[PDB]
Write a protein that binds this ligand. Structure first.
Ligand SMILES: [Zn+2]
Ligand SMILES: [Zn+2]
Ligand SMILES: [Zn+2]
Ligand SMILES: [Zn+2]
Lengths: 25, 81
DNA sequence: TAAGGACCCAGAT
DNA sequence: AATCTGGGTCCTT
């Protein structure tokens, strides 16, 4: 929820789940 | 450069500095002192805390070499100079 | 090159 | 009075 990707806007509950998604783009 | 906190909308400066601000809201303390088990929100706060166990004193007086753990102790010391 | 790591500091406990 | 909180900037791959 509070960790929001600034490229695709997907929301992630923890910081690692946000940084896990940074490799998608 | 900077980002708005999605909880309180405050602008937080610094690439990579939002998570530490968010933890002021969540109370998450991911960093733990290996010795006394005390936990901290921030890696840099843990690092200063470990000086209590290691006795390290990185603040050095260039005049006499007196060594301190905190910069304000060093500041206090430099009056004698 | 993000962002980790380091350190400073104004205000608060 | 000393030490802490939270937010700032610089450096280094
Ligand atoms: Zn994304
Ligand atoms: Zn906030
Ligand atoms: Zn400790
Ligand atoms: Zn001295």
């Amino acid at each position: 929820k509070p960790y929001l990707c600034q490229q695709c806007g997907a929301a992630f509950a923890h910081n690692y789940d946000l940084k896990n998604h940074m490799r998608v783009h | 450069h900077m980002q708005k906190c999605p909880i309180c909308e405050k602008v937080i400066q610094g690439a990579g500095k939002l998570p530490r601000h968010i933890r002021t809201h969540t109370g998450e303390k991911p960093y733990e002192c290996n010795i006394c088990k005390v936990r901290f929100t921030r890696q840099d706060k843990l690092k200063v805390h470990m000086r209590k166990h290691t006795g390290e004193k990185p603040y050095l007086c260039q005049q006499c070499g007196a060594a301190f753990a905190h910069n304000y102790d060093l500041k206090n010391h430099m009056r004698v100079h």
